[PDB]
Design an enzyme around this catalytic site. Structure first.
Site, PDB file in Angstrom:
ATOM      1  N   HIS A 103      62.356  42.892  20.794  1.00 40.18           N
ATOM      2  CA  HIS A 103      62.784  42.562  21.867  1.00 40.18           C
ATOM      3  C   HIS A 103      61.532  42.701  22.823  1.00 40.18           C
ATOM      4  CE1 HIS A 103      65.321  43.140  26.104  1.00 40.18           C
ATOM      5  NE2 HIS A 103      64.590  44.548  25.897  1.00 40.18           N
ATOM      6  N   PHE A 104      61.534  41.779  23.991  1.00 43.24           N
ATOM      7  CA  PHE A 104      60.518  41.767  24.865  1.00 43.24           C
ATOM      8  C   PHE A 104      61.075  42.640  26.059  1.00 43.24           C
ATOM      9  CE2 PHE A 104      56.248  40.710  25.968  1.00 43.24           C
ATOM     10  CZ  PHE A 104      56.353  40.557  27.470  1.00 43.24           C
TER      11      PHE A 104
HETATM   12 CL   LIG Z   1      61.230  37.493  28.084  1.00 46.96          CL
END
Ligand SMILES: [Cl-]
Ligand SMILES: [Cl-]
Lengths: 124, 124
Positions: B119-120
């Site tokens: 996850h960013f």
């Molecule tokens: Cl993003």
């Protein structure tokens, strides 16, 4: 009860310094802005520009918020900011923060009228 | 069903270019990465570094995620990135995006073992 506008000012504004002082800037600021009171706020950004420059961002580029709402605005210019994030070695009430100074565009959600920043969405 | 690791690669990796090409980079990339299929993804960041440099961020600085979890890591160095955000003049299926090219540290959540980005969380 704090207005949403007042809460944004308290959590994200630091017009008194041009940039984060040293590595202890976040421990000091997160504490004196009461962000370490009952819990350690995990992530918080401080903007080092005048309140007026930050407020003007509500008339700048209308962009979507990460949450999908459409009342977010990205500043046309980069601003001095400081990201404060808890270190893995942080545990309430002995909050520990990493200070990361940078210049980026800020994106804020605006609301109310007076139409002012009420949430810090992200920096770019 | 796409693994979380595969989804991160698809939504956030763009190792083929050193930086966003022109103002149309996001419209093109959000479309070809299938982020405009049933809906317009409101916000998405692309990282212009090798997959190996992005994956190494999972052994870098352990910092908290905006959500409070503790499996986030901030890269020691700045990386070329491009923020893609819907313009107020965007409406599915005629998705419209603002392209903002920059160099910042990225913060990603890692998980699984192989322990890779899933996850960013944000850029600084
Ligand atoms: Cl993003
Ligand atoms: Cl924040």
């Amino acid at each position: 009860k704090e207005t949403a506008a007042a809460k944004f000012e308290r959590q994200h504004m630091d017009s008194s310094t041009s940039a984060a002082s040293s590595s202890n800037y976040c421990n000091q600021m997160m504490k004196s802005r009461n962000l370490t009171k009952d819990r350690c706020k995990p992530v918080n950004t401080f903007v080092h520009e005048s309140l007026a420059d930050v407020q003007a961002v509500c008339s700048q580029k209308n962009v979507a918020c990460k949450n999908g709402q459409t009342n977010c605005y990205q500043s046309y210019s980069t601003m001095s900011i400081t990201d404060c994030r808890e270190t893995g070695s942080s545990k309430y009430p002995n909050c520990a923060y990493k200070t990361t100074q940078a210049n980026k565009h800020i994106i804020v959600a605006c609301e109310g009228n007076a139409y002012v920043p009420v949430h810090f969405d992200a920096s770019v």
